mmCIF file of C-alpha atoms and ligand atoms in Angstrom:
data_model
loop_
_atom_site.group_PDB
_atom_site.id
_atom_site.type_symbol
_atom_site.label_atom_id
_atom_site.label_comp_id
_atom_site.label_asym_id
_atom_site.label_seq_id
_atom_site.Cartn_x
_atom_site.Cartn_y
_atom_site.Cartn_z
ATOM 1 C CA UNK A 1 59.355 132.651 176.050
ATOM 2 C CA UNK A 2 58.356 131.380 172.720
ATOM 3 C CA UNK A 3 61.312 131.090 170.769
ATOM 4 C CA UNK A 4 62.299 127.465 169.999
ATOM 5 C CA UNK A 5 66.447 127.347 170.121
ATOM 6 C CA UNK A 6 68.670 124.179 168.814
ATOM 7 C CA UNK A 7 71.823 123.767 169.594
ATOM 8 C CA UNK A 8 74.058 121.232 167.889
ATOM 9 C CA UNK A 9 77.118 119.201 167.543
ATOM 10 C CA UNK A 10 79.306 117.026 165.052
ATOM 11 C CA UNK A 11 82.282 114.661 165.899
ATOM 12 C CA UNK A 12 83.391 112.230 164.262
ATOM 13 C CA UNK A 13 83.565 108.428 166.080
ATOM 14 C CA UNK A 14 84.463 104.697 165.283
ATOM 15 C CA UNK A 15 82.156 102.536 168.052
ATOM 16 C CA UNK A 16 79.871 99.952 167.446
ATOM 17 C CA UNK A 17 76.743 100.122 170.115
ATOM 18 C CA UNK A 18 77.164 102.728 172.505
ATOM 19 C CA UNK A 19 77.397 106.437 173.154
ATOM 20 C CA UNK A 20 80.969 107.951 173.751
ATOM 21 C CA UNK A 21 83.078 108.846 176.753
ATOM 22 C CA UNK A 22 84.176 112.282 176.245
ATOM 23 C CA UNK A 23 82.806 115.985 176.929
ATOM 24 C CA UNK A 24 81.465 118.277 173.772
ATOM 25 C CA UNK A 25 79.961 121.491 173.973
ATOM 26 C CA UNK A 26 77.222 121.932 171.065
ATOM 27 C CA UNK A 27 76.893 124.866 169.459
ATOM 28 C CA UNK A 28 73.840 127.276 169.094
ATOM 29 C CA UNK A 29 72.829 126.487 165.010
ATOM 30 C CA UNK A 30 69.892 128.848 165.161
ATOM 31 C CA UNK A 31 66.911 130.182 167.594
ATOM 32 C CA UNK A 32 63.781 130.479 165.560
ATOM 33 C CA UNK A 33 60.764 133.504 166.815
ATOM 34 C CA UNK A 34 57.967 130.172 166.279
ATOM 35 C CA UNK A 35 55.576 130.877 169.082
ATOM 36 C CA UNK A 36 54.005 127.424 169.845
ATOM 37 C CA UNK A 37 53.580 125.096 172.641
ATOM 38 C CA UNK A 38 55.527 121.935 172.094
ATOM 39 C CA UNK A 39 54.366 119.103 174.428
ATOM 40 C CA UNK A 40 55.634 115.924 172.084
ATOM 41 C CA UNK A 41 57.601 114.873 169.633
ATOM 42 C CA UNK A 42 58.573 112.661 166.768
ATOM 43 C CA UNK A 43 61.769 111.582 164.388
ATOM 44 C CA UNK A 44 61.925 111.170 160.516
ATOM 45 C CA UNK A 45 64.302 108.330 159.568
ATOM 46 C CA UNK A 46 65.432 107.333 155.560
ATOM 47 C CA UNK A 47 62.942 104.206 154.743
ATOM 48 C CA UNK B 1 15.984 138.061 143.536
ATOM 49 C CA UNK B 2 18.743 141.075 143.497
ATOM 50 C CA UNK B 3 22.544 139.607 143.220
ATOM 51 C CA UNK B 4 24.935 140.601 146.451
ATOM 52 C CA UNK B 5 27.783 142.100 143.798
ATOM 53 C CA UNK B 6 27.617 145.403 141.717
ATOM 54 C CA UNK B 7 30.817 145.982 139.110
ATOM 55 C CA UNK B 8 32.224 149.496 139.612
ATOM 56 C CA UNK B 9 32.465 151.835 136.837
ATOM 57 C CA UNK B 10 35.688 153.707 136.568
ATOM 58 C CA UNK B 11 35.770 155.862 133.372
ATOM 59 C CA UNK B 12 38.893 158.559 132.862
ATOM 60 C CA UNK B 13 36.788 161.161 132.581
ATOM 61 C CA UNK B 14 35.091 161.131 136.047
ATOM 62 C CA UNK B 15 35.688 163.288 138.972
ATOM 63 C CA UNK B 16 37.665 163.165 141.798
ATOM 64 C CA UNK B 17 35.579 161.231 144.943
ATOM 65 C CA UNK B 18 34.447 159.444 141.904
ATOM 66 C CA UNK B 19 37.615 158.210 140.795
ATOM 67 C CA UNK B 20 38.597 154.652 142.186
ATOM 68 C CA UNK B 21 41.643 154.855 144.950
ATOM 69 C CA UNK B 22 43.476 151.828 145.722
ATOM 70 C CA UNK B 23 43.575 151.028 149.481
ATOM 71 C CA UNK B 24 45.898 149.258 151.825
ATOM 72 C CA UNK B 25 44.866 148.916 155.445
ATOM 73 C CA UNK B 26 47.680 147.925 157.784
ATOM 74 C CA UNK B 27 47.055 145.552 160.614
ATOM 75 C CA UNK B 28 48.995 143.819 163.686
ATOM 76 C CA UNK B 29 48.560 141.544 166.845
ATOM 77 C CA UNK B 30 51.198 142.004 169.524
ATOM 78 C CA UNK B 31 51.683 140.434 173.176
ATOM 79 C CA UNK B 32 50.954 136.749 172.528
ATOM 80 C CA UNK B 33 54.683 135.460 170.622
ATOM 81 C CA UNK B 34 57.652 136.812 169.734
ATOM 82 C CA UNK B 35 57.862 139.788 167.319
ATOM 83 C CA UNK B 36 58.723 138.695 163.803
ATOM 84 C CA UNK B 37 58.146 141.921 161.951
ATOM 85 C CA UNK B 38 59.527 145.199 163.489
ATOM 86 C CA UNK B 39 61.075 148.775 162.411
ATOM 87 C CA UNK B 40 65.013 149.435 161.170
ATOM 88 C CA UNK B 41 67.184 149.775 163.666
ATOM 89 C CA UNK B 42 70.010 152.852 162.456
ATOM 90 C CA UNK B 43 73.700 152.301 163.268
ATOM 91 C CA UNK B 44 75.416 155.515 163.559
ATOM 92 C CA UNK B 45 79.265 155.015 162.411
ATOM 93 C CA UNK B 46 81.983 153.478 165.226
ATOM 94 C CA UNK B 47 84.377 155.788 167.171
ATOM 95 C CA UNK B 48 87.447 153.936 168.380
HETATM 96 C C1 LIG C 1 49.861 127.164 175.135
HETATM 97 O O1 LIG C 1 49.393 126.263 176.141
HETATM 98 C C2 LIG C 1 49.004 126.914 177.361
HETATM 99 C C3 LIG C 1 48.635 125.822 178.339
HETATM 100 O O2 LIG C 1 47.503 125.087 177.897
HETATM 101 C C4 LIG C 1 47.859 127.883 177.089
HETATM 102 O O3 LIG C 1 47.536 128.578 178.290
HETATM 103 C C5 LIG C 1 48.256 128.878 176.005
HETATM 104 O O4 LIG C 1 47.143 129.697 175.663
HETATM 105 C C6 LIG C 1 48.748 128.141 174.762
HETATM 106 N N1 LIG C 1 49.199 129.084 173.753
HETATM 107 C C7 LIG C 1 48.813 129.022 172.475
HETATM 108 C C8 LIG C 1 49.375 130.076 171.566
HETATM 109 O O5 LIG C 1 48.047 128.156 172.066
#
């Protein structure tokens, strides 16, 4: 209903090429009032 | 060949009606996203 809510998580790990068997519940960081359609998106990696 | 813009004259001795006012007009949109701008919402104190 146009707010745009992330929820998050940090643990800490030591595994070389997969993701991790175990169960985390992440955290609401913040819900923010934004308003727009979101149909794609895109990630911003250090060059 | 008259120009579109005419500089007002506001001397301190003019009347009132003739003096300049400064204007705000306050606008809004509603119904369309979520409101972002809103009144304060009092707190009374807390009975326990
Ligand atoms: C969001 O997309 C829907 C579907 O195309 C459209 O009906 C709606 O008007 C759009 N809203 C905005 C704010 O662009």
């Amino acid at each position: 209903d146009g707010y745009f809510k992330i929820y998050s998580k940090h643990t800490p790990i030591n595994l070389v090429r997969d993701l991790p068997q175990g169960f985390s519940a992440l955290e609401p960081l913040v819900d923010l009032p934004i308003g727009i359609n979101i149909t794609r998106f895109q990630t911003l990696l250090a060059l | 060949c008259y120009f579109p813009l005419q500089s007002y004259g506001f001397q301190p001795t003019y009347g009132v009606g003739y003096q300049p006012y400064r204007v705000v007009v306050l606008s809004f949109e509603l119904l369309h996203a979520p409101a972002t701008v809103c009144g304060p919402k009092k707190s009374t104190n807390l009975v326990k």
